[PDB]
């Protein structure tokens, strides 16, 4: 077996739980893949530029995290896929010697949902473009909270909603697809999302793996909640699909993945 270097871009990166999943899978897969992938954590510095370092790494392929995402997008050199509609990227494959981006966010998160009807997104990153894309395309009706006018316009070109002020509405899907988490803190006022708990169907964090403040108001309030661990898995899942280039499905890899973490 020939080796392939991949990795995940991040920062930080060191909460990811990807290594662990992708190498599982790379290991498992090697005699179907007919080579041995090795996939390794990349803290990247902000000044760096994702495809000199793919590149000067000499990787077969990566992941993207925060807050790298809609930089991913905008130095590939080809983009496919839903990736297109999310103005986002969180999957890179080297093809004949093109880097070309992949969205897997979408679906995995998606996937992930155990009859919803509305959503709100807190935040405007990557995450959240590719979650408003995603649920838009399955009509539920998307309104969107930011703090800012950084990326209205894109929202705005998906028809969602778009808010800085907490709309005073009920929603089935509250999301936090904010870095709130990551600083352990609510991305709202308790009062508002205290609000928004008690008349929702579901509280969702984006965050893995630990009880978030997000969560674990709505865990007092008795709100159904869930943590992004399953949409981790999904995601992957999908990424490695493309990592394989689509020779092992997602649902292969993903058992393979959930059954590990």
Do not use: W
């Given at each position: ?17 990807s ?63 839903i ?101 352990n ?44 661990k ?9 990424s ?22």
């Open positions: 077996m020939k080796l392939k270097s991949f990795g995940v871009f991040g920062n930080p990166i060191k909460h990811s739980k290594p662990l999943i992708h190498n599982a899978c790379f290991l498992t897969f090697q005699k179907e893949l007919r080579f041995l992938g090795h996939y390794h954590p990349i803290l990247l510095p902000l000044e760096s530029h994702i495809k000199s370092e793919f590149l000067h790494l000499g990787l077969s392929g990566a992941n993207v995290t925060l807050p790298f995402k809609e930089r991913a997008f905008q130095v590939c050199d080809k983009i496919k896929g990736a297109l509609e999310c103005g986002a990227v969180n999957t890179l494959v080297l093809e004949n010697d093109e880097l070309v981006g992949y969205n897997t966010d979408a679906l995995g998160f998606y996937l992930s949902l155990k009859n919803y009807q509305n959503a709100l997104i807190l935040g405007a990153g990557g995450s959240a473009k590719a979650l408003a894309c995603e649920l838009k395309k399955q009509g539920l009706q998307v309104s969107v909270l930011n703090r800012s006018s950084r990326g209205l316009d894109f929202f705005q070109r998906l028809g969602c909603d778009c808010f800085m002020e907490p709309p005073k509405s009920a929603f089935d899907l509250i999301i936090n697809a904010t870095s709130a988490s990551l600083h803190e609510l991305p709202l006022n308790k009062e508002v999302l205290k609000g928004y708990f008690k008349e929702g169907k579901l509280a969702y964090d984006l965050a893995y793996g630990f009880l978030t403040p997000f969560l674990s108001l709505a865990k007092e309030l008795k709100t159904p909640f869930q943590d992004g399953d949409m981790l898995i999904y995601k992957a899942a999908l490695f699909e493309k990592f394989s280039a689509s020779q092992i499905p997602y649902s292969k890899a993903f058992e393979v993945m959930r059954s590990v973490f």
